[PDB]
Design a protein around this ligand. Structure first.
Ligand SMILES: [Zn+2]
Ligand SMILES: [Zn+2]
Lengths: 148, 150
């Protein structure tokens, strides 16, 4: 229900935004949702292929589906560990620390300064948000994308 | 070719290409109107400007509000609750004293983070983690208490 909660929020978001979930995009979304942990690009391709030997999606098609999710902010690249993670959503605890994500490149870094976060979360609760129903995200621009 | 608000419209158009979104004329029209205005814009005002820009044949109000919902749902435009008016996303090099926004990802309502102490620390942490808080003001994304309860 963790994974179903993620799929439902992205489907709801796509409906609202005018985005289209083709079959591969829904397939990839489901595999990422059912992982519940960061995913390597090679694991996603293996999983997509596990269905049919010959009738499998070509790798570029699989990775364009992953880029679609990243570009729309449903998935980030945790470059810490060279893997892909679902956006924060109304999910469980025990792996929830805010993400800092770049607008252009969709890499994420985890904000691990407990008192900066705690202050940020306090400000947001006072201002009408629920930092514990959904872990916050900070969105900005990385130094590397800023250089161009 | 493109100055500073024109860069913003360009980058939204590029983002549409990478995301799988269609930027119709009315969507580009409302975006450019919001971007060129500097100050938050009321909805009735965009509707005014859209009619003034076109004249005979103007888009009906439902078309203009749906284009605004498109822009909000995709995070290019927020509704600033305090002034009940719309503002562009934070974007690169807009030259001003801008402050970070806190946006609900469900209703697209935003509020400014006016706590200098908390903002200063966040930007300091972001600079330490590899980001450029001066190249583009930070946004914080969360779920509002009202949207959470519904
Ligand atoms: Zn980047
Ligand atoms: Zn809300």
């Amino acid at each position: 229900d963790d994974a179903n909660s993620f799929v439902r929020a992205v489907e709801r978001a796509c409906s609202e935004r005018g985005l289209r979930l083709t079959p591969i995009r829904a397939n990839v979304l489901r595999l990422i949702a059912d992982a519940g942990k960061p995913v390597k690009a090679y694991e996603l391709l293996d999983w997509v292929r596990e269905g049919k030997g010959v009738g499998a999606d070509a790798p570029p098609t699989v990775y364009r589906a992953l880029d679609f999710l990243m570009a729309n902010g449903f998935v980030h690249k945790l470059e810490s560990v060279n893997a892909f993670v679902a956006c924060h959503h109304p999910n469980s605890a025990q792996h929830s620390v805010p993400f800092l994500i770049c607008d252009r490149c969709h890499s994420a870094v985890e904000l691990e300064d407990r008192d900066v976060v705690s202050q940020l979360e306090a400000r947001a609760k006072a201002l009408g948000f629920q930092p514990q129903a959904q872990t916050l995200e900070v969105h900005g621009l990385c130094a590397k994308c800023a250089a161009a």
